[PDB]
Amino acid sequence: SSQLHVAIVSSPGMGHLIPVLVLGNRLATHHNIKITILAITTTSSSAETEFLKKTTLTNEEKTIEIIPVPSVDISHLINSSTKIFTQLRLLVREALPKIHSTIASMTHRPDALIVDIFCTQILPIAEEFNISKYTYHPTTAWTLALAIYCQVFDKEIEGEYVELKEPLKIPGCKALRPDDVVDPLLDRSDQQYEEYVKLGKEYTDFDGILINTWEDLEPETINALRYNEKLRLLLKVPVFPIGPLRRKVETTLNDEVIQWLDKQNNESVLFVSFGSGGTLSTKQMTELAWGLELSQQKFVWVVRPPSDDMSEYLPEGFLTRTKDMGLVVPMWANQVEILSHSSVGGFLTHCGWNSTVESLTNGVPMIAWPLHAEQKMNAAMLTEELGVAIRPAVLPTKKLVKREEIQGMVRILMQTKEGKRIKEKAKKLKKSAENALSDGGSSYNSICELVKDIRSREL
Template identity: 80%
Template structure:
């Protein structure tokens, strides 16, 4: 079949962190491989940013977006229900609507690609006999853990965090107990059960796309393809692995807002961008310490500030962007904005992250290590201060600091204890002023080139996407 006649539907779970990689993937397949793309986006009614983003994306003619209305799940959850579980329930409740949308399509998709929380689509894909692929929009290391967790679940007793030895994923870097993903922190919680189920569902797909590239994670990708013990959990023979990254948003040439204009006036690679993603929040105490650390460091900074939360670190995820931009700055130490007015810029709630990270005056990124943000940093050659908050971010931070050498991190995980101002000041100075920081920056720039090569025609990720398209065409 000619790829120009292909129709691929991509299903996105709620939240900006999931919607962005799906839209980027859709745009890539549409513009580089001439495929008709329909995105089914499960929406939430609470996120203004998400609504605006969908509306803007609708204006692009390369893809069709069908919003799947938000389902009221208030009767199925309570205040203690973890975010991972909420996502799974939201998707589960949206399945009847997703099924009816697919059933009503005049040109039935030749393939269905689903993101990380939408793997519960399996019965629908099988009912309509549509080839199905999972899209894992983060690292191959987290994918290996996802699919192998079903083995750990049977073989390991007690809590993973209490283990004295690292978890051994066949063919991959071992995983320290303190770095396990959030759903593995408490095996009695519903999110753990949902996590294990999701890993099992992954193994029933016709292949998996990963937002990484060969040179970034060679050993793990090799293990996913060739390690008999790791592949023994896969239910599909010859289960293909497609590293197709690093896919990220492109810089939009638009009006130069206040932040970009401020950056224009700064020296080359002199500014640290500080942001915790579309849903990450800090405690009140940690926010105060971070403010003091930035001020004491005397380094230039742009800080995206949102109100603190003394609950879960992911509490803002489904309400990113919010409606309240007034209160964010009120939580900063008294006089902070006045004292740092010549040194830094504080931006309430949201900023153009891709444009900021691609600006020549940005030389560092203090980040929560969400994979979208990490990719946006690496593809611009910007080194990082790793500050993981939730989900798989501890694994990402470990990989960035220990394997790739493009980040420094606090001595103790920020999820375990407060990172004090003195340590923050020290990390800022190490990254921006020392030989160690220079070495980290050079490694980040090499990865930028590696990423560019992977996506160029004939590069590993370009060839991987071609392989996926060929696989769909021949089914």
């Protein structure tokens, strides 16, 4: 059968574009699919727009093309209380005219549209043009089951979710501690709550849902999404675990971090990074600085100014005391390259799924320090279910983590026999992930099943 054309729509931000590009890459190379990426961007001045200028919009063999789609300016449509979830929904809504015309001009219409979590409002455009439409859930199956079931919790639960004193029971799935609810569930009176319940229903309107997870990681929740009688009252279409999708390493030979790592022993270094979406209070940054020093472990720490020469933000004499023990890297690092280095033995992260996937596919265990979005659910999975992470006694967003506990966690993970058990479990998940993505593996098979659904709908 002849070539399929699939357009994938990314919402604004590198955090959304990159996984879309990774999916596009996998579909064009291993699945004979011609890919168009519709990369919705902000009006101006984005890390994303800079990326798109430095990179080429098309590849050698004309199998992938990136079409930047700039949104309009939304600053007049928001205020200081407007949450990120709401802002993303609004940026895509405002780009719908330009998404519509972009698709209209495509003489060879796409055989299918795959849209981001934050692009489900494109659904009526797919309808209008008679294009098969699928959505891509860029994080765990557990969080997908929450979004879809939330419309039930909304009618069955009277007050704030955060005030419940019993787990929320997702049929057939892990029960959810009220402390761990995703961000939009923290305040039902906020606009983003209703937007989130709406999203959970919009999933149901698609022809299928791709998930950035794999069968062996979440067998219970995937099986529930497929067959559980209560969830299937709500979800009528298949799910496709096609992950874990992760960006490729792009080397920089003269990278001083990599040079410093090259001189360390195997699996001896704690990488500490809260990414771009992460900041700590002044008080928390001080405790983290002291915990790292007190641990006497090797570390690489990506530092950013705190929020209530990086020397101003560290304890007096920090860089002198920790010379030879630790590297303080300012603002940014090649994270995927660092996590693949043989000297890295642990990762203190916020548990964003992209970061988690980059860690697990390198077999690196974690200290789970969730901050926002769906990270508390990710952290709960990594520590309670998967056994590849340790964590503070109390959520960092509830209580200050003190230097003593941080010292103790770094030690447990990097020195004790317990930490070695956690590292071995992470090495097993690395293999599970590799198997899933291999030819004939579960995520490979799920892509073939997706392609069959697309073809079937054109008969």
